Coordinates of C-alpha atoms and ligand atoms in Angstrom, one line a residue:
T3 CA -125.1 49.7 -12.3
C4 CA -124.1 47.3 -9.6
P5 CA -126.4 47.2 -6.6
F6 CA -125.0 47.6 -3.1
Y7 CA -126.1 44.1 -1.9
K8 CA -123.5 42.6 -4.5
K9 CA -120.5 44.5 -3.1
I10 CA -118.4 43.4 -0.1
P11 CA -117.3 46.5 1.9
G12 CA -113.6 46.9 2.7
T13 CA -112.6 44.8 -0.2
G14 CA -112.1 44.9 -3.9
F15 CA -114.7 42.1 -4.2
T16 CA -118.1 41.6 -5.8
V17 CA -120.5 38.5 -5.7
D18 CA -122.5 37.3 -8.7
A19 CA -122.0 40.7 -10.5
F20 CA -121.1 39.9 -14.2
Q21 CA -123.8 41.9 -16.0
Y22 CA -122.7 45.5 -15.1
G23 CA -119.5 45.8 -17.2
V24 CA -116.2 46.6 -15.5
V25 CA -117.3 47.4 -11.9
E26 CA -115.3 50.3 -10.6
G27 CA -112.8 49.1 -8.0
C28 CA -113.4 45.4 -8.4
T29 CA -110.1 43.3 -8.3
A30 CA -111.8 39.8 -8.0
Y31 CA -115.4 38.6 -9.1
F32 CA -116.8 35.7 -7.1
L33 CA -119.4 33.4 -8.6
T34 CA -121.5 31.4 -6.0
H35 CA -123.0 28.9 -8.6
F36 CA -123.7 28.2 -12.2
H37 CA -127.4 29.5 -12.6
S38 CA -128.1 32.1 -15.3
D39 CA -129.5 35.0 -13.2
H40 CA -126.1 34.8 -11.3
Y41 CA -123.6 34.3 -14.1
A42 CA -125.4 36.6 -16.6
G43 CA -122.7 38.5 -18.4
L44 CA -119.8 35.9 -18.4
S45 CA -118.4 34.7 -21.8
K46 CA -115.1 33.7 -23.4
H47 CA -114.1 37.5 -23.6
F48 CA -114.0 38.0 -19.9
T49 CA -110.5 39.0 -18.7
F50 CA -110.8 39.5 -14.9
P51 CA -110.1 36.8 -12.2
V52 CA -113.2 34.6 -11.3
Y53 CA -113.2 32.9 -8.0
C54 CA -115.5 29.8 -7.6
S55 CA -115.7 26.1 -6.8
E56 CA -114.0 23.4 -8.9
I57 CA -117.4 22.3 -10.3
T58 CA -118.4 25.9 -11.2
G59 CA -115.0 26.3 -12.8
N60 CA -115.6 23.1 -15.0
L61 CA -118.8 24.6 -16.3
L62 CA -117.3 28.1 -17.0
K63 CA -114.5 26.4 -19.1
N64 CA -116.7 23.9 -21.0
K65 CA -120.1 25.6 -21.3
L66 CA -119.3 29.3 -21.4
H67 CA -115.6 29.0 -22.8
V68 CA -114.1 31.3 -20.3
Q69 CA -110.4 30.9 -20.7
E70 CA -108.5 28.9 -18.1
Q71 CA -106.1 31.6 -17.1
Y72 CA -109.0 33.6 -15.6
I73 CA -110.6 30.7 -13.7
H74 CA -109.6 30.4 -10.1
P75 CA -111.1 27.3 -8.4
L76 CA -110.8 27.0 -4.6
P77 CA -111.3 23.9 -2.5
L78 CA -114.1 23.8 0.1
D79 CA -113.6 24.1 3.9
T80 CA -110.2 25.6 3.4
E81 CA -108.7 28.9 4.5
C82 CA -107.4 30.7 1.3
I83 CA -105.9 34.2 0.8
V84 CA -107.3 36.2 -2.1
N85 CA -105.8 39.7 -2.9
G86 CA -104.8 40.0 0.7
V87 CA -108.0 38.8 2.4
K88 CA -108.8 35.4 4.0
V89 CA -111.8 33.6 2.5
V90 CA -113.5 30.2 2.9
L91 CA -116.0 28.4 0.6
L92 CA -118.7 26.3 2.2
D93 CA -121.2 23.9 0.6
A94 CA -124.5 25.7 0.1
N95 CA -126.8 22.6 -0.2
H96 CA -128.2 24.2 -3.5
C97 CA -127.2 22.8 -7.0
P98 CA -123.8 21.0 -7.7
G99 CA -120.8 23.3 -7.1
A100 CA -122.9 25.9 -5.2
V101 CA -121.1 27.7 -2.3
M102 CA -121.5 30.2 0.5
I103 CA -118.5 32.5 1.0
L104 CA -117.0 33.6 4.4
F105 CA -114.9 36.8 4.2
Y106 CA -112.5 37.8 7.1
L107 CA -112.1 41.6 6.6
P108 CA -108.8 43.3 7.5
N109 CA -110.6 45.5 10.1
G110 CA -111.9 42.3 12.1
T111 CA -115.5 42.2 10.6
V112 CA -116.6 38.7 9.4
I113 CA -119.2 38.5 6.5
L114 CA -121.2 35.4 5.3
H115 CA -122.7 35.5 1.8
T116 CA -125.0 32.5 1.4
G117 CA -125.3 32.7 -2.3
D118 CA -128.4 30.6 -3.1
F119 CA -128.8 27.9 -0.2
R120 CA -131.1 25.4 1.5
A121 CA -130.3 25.8 5.2
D122 CA -129.6 22.7 7.1
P123 CA -128.7 21.9 10.8
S124 CA -125.5 20.3 9.4
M125 CA -124.3 23.8 8.7
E126 CA -124.2 24.5 12.5
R127 CA -121.1 22.1 12.5
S128 CA -119.1 23.5 9.7
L129 CA -116.4 26.2 10.1
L130 CA -119.2 28.6 10.8
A131 CA -119.3 27.3 14.4
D132 CA -115.8 28.7 15.1
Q133 CA -116.3 32.5 15.1
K134 CA -118.8 35.3 15.2
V135 CA -120.4 36.6 12.0
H136 CA -121.3 40.3 12.0
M137 CA -123.0 40.6 8.6
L138 CA -125.2 38.1 6.6
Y139 CA -126.0 38.5 2.9
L140 CA -129.0 36.1 2.9
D141 CA -131.0 34.1 0.2
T142 CA -134.5 35.3 1.1
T143 CA -136.3 33.5 -1.8
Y144 CA -139.0 31.9 0.5
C145 CA -138.9 34.3 3.5
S146 CA -142.6 34.1 4.4
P147 CA -144.4 31.6 6.6
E148 CA -146.7 30.2 3.9
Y149 CA -143.6 28.6 2.3
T150 CA -143.6 25.1 3.7
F151 CA -142.5 22.1 1.7
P152 CA -141.3 18.5 2.6
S153 CA -137.7 17.2 2.9
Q154 CA -135.9 16.3 -0.3
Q155 CA -135.8 12.6 1.0
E156 CA -139.7 12.5 1.4
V157 CA -140.1 13.9 -2.1
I158 CA -137.7 11.4 -3.7
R159 CA -139.5 8.5 -1.9
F160 CA -142.7 9.7 -3.5
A161 CA -141.2 9.9 -6.9
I162 CA -139.4 6.5 -6.8
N163 CA -142.6 4.7 -5.4
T164 CA -144.8 6.4 -8.1
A165 CA -142.5 5.5 -11.0
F166 CA -141.8 1.9 -10.0
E167 CA -145.6 1.2 -9.5
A168 CA -146.5 2.6 -12.9
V169 CA -143.8 0.9 -14.9
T170 CA -144.4 -2.5 -13.1
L171 CA -148.1 -2.3 -14.0
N172 CA -147.2 -1.3 -17.6
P173 CA -143.8 -2.2 -18.9
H174 CA -144.5 -0.1 -22.0
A175 CA -144.8 3.2 -20.0
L176 CA -142.0 5.8 -20.5
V177 CA -140.9 8.1 -17.6
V178 CA -140.0 11.7 -18.6
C179 CA -138.4 14.3 -16.3
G180 CA -138.1 18.1 -17.1
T181 CA -135.0 20.2 -16.5
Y182 CA -133.7 23.8 -17.5
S183 CA -130.7 24.3 -15.4
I184 CA -128.3 22.3 -13.2
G185 CA -129.8 21.1 -9.8
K186 CA -132.3 18.5 -8.8
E187 CA -130.4 15.7 -10.5
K188 CA -131.5 13.3 -7.6
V189 CA -135.1 13.3 -9.1
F190 CA -134.1 11.6 -12.4
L191 CA -131.2 9.6 -11.0
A192 CA -133.3 8.0 -8.2
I193 CA -136.0 7.0 -10.6
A194 CA -133.6 5.5 -13.2
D195 CA -131.9 3.5 -10.4
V196 CA -135.2 1.9 -9.2
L197 CA -136.0 1.0 -12.9
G198 CA -132.6 -0.5 -13.8
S199 CA -132.1 2.0 -16.5
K200 CA -129.7 4.8 -17.6
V201 CA -131.1 8.3 -18.1
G202 CA -131.3 9.4 -21.7
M203 CA -130.8 13.0 -22.8
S204 CA -129.5 15.4 -25.4
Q205 CA -125.8 15.8 -26.2
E206 CA -125.9 19.4 -24.7
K207 CA -127.3 18.1 -21.4
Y208 CA -125.0 15.1 -21.2
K209 CA -122.0 17.5 -21.6
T210 CA -123.3 19.7 -18.7
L211 CA -123.7 16.6 -16.4
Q212 CA -120.2 15.4 -17.3
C213 CA -118.8 18.7 -15.6
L214 CA -120.3 17.9 -12.2
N215 CA -118.0 15.3 -10.4
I216 CA -120.8 13.0 -9.7
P217 CA -119.4 9.5 -8.7
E218 CA -119.9 6.7 -11.2
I219 CA -121.8 9.0 -13.6
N220 CA -120.7 7.1 -16.8
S221 CA -122.8 4.2 -15.3
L222 CA -126.0 6.4 -14.9
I223 CA -126.5 8.6 -18.0
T224 CA -126.4 8.2 -21.8
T225 CA -127.1 10.0 -25.2
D226 CA -128.7 6.8 -26.6
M227 CA -132.4 7.4 -26.0
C228 CA -133.4 4.0 -27.6
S229 CA -131.7 2.1 -24.8
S230 CA -133.2 4.2 -21.9
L231 CA -136.7 4.2 -20.3
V232 CA -136.2 7.5 -18.3
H233 CA -135.8 10.5 -20.7
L234 CA -134.9 14.1 -19.8
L235 CA -136.5 16.9 -21.7
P236 CA -136.5 20.7 -21.5
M237 CA -139.0 21.9 -18.9
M238 CA -140.9 23.8 -21.6
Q239 CA -141.8 20.5 -23.3
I240 CA -143.5 19.1 -20.0
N241 CA -147.1 19.6 -21.2
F242 CA -149.6 17.5 -23.0
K243 CA -148.7 18.7 -26.5
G244 CA -144.9 18.4 -26.0
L245 CA -145.3 14.9 -24.5
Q246 CA -147.6 13.5 -27.2
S247 CA -145.0 14.7 -29.8
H248 CA -142.2 13.0 -27.9
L249 CA -144.2 9.7 -27.7
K250 CA -144.6 9.7 -31.5
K251 CA -140.8 10.0 -31.8
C252 CA -140.3 6.8 -29.8
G253 CA -141.6 4.6 -32.7
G254 CA -144.3 2.5 -30.9
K255 CA -141.9 1.3 -28.2
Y256 CA -144.2 3.0 -25.6
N257 CA -147.9 3.5 -25.1
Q258 CA -148.0 5.7 -21.9
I259 CA -146.0 8.6 -20.4
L260 CA -145.6 9.4 -16.7
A261 CA -143.8 12.8 -16.4
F262 CA -142.4 14.8 -13.5
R263 CA -142.0 18.6 -13.2
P264 CA -139.8 19.4 -10.1
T265 CA -141.2 22.9 -9.3
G266 CA -140.0 24.9 -6.2
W267 CA -143.1 25.9 -4.2
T268 CA -146.7 25.8 -5.6
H269 CA -149.8 26.9 -3.4
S270 CA -151.1 23.3 -3.5
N271 CA -148.4 23.2 -0.6
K272 CA -150.7 25.2 1.8
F273 CA -153.3 22.5 2.0
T274 CA -152.1 19.2 0.5
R275 CA -149.6 16.7 2.0
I276 CA -146.9 14.9 -0.3
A277 CA -148.8 11.6 0.2
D278 CA -151.9 13.2 -1.3
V279 CA -150.3 14.7 -4.5
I280 CA -152.2 13.8 -7.7
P281 CA -151.3 14.3 -11.4
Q282 CA -152.9 16.1 -14.3
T283 CA -154.0 13.5 -16.8
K284 CA -155.0 13.5 -20.5
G285 CA -155.5 10.2 -22.1
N286 CA -152.3 8.0 -21.8
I287 CA -150.2 11.1 -20.4
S288 CA -150.0 11.9 -16.6
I289 CA -147.9 14.9 -15.3
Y290 CA -146.9 15.2 -11.6
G291 CA -145.7 18.6 -10.1
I292 CA -143.5 17.6 -7.2
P293 CA -142.2 20.2 -4.6
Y294 CA -138.5 19.5 -4.7
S295 CA -136.8 22.6 -3.4
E296 CA -133.1 23.7 -3.4
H297 CA -133.9 26.8 -1.3
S298 CA -134.6 27.1 2.4
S299 CA -138.2 26.8 3.7
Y300 CA -139.2 29.7 6.0
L301 CA -138.7 27.5 9.1
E302 CA -135.2 26.3 7.9
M303 CA -134.2 29.9 7.2
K304 CA -135.4 31.1 10.6
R305 CA -133.5 28.3 12.5
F306 CA -130.3 29.1 10.7
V307 CA -130.5 32.9 11.3
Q308 CA -131.5 32.4 15.0
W309 CA -128.5 30.0 15.5
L310 CA -126.0 32.4 13.6
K311 CA -127.2 35.6 15.4
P312 CA -125.9 38.1 12.9
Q313 CA -125.7 41.8 13.8
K314 CA -127.0 42.9 10.4
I315 CA -129.0 41.1 7.6
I316 CA -128.8 42.1 3.9
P317 CA -131.4 40.3 1.7
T318 CA -130.3 39.3 -1.8
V319 CA -133.8 38.1 -3.1
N320 CA -137.2 39.9 -3.3
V321 CA -135.5 43.3 -2.9
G322 CA -137.3 45.0 -5.7
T323 CA -140.5 46.1 -3.9
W324 CA -141.1 48.2 -0.8
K325 CA -143.8 45.7 0.4
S326 CA -141.4 42.8 0.1
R327 CA -138.5 44.6 1.8
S328 CA -140.9 45.7 4.7
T329 CA -142.2 42.1 5.1
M330 CA -138.8 40.6 5.3
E331 CA -137.5 43.4 7.8
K332 CA -140.5 42.5 10.1
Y333 CA -139.6 38.8 10.2
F334 CA -136.0 39.7 11.0
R335 CA -137.0 41.7 14.0
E336 CA -139.4 39.0 15.2
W337 CA -136.6 36.5 15.1
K338 CA -134.2 38.7 16.9
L339 CA -136.7 39.5 19.7
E340 CA -137.7 35.8 20.1
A341 CA -134.1 34.5 20.4
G342 CA -132.7 37.5 22.4
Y343 CA -129.7 38.7 20.2
Ligands
NI401 NI1 -129.8 29.3 -7.9

């Protein structure tokens, strides 16, 4: 049954709640983004209205075959009326098509549901600046002070410089990048751009990227692996056995692999700087784990919440254990006493 933190009081609405059957009283099902733990349950047999971004709507139609008559895409940064209630979708700085949702309840309460997000100071100048928010349904994935990681720009600078150095020393080196969901496309696109190559990938992954409204995409990606020297593979193949096997498939065109795994956080973060990251190597294969996050760091999350000053916080991540729930509640109170709301 549907947990409370997925239901929006005073409405017929749920958020990211497609795996519980027909939810009692739900007139509209919102989907924040196209990641499997959030869309789990959707398919071509779904017959209720789905509210989402244009990009998420492209993926529901093409990848899951949801019928068009049930897909309701909304433009961003625009006041819209859904079943009698004003809503706005805001960019969540997560994966492509990911949104936060502002609900303006008939009784005067305002609720922000962040979906999955990476907080940024630019959000302080969106439509959030313009009224009070009473209740915040918060992506708490990294809500603990140990979770530090660099900016996305520092991480991409590292990746581009590493790849261009390796391939210029050895023009017969192949670069491979792992993936298992949408998001983090900057990693492989930035590396292919510095090398003067398109990115090569499977038909299934190419289809997925063609749903994303990325400018000039036909110029950046391809299904012809033979023409490309940056390949995308499933994340599960980014290990020495999977990579040796891939190199065999390339018919002696290459003699070395440099591979990237864009992880979220890994405890190498608590000691080591981005400058200092080193790979795991076996023979002519090197694998770099790089800390490219699409969720808030602890400090980014804290700045957002202290700026927004909500009256009540509802976590949506790490809610399964009493120890986690107690830890998060303690940081919420610290933040509130430090800032004075
Ligand atoms: Ni996500």
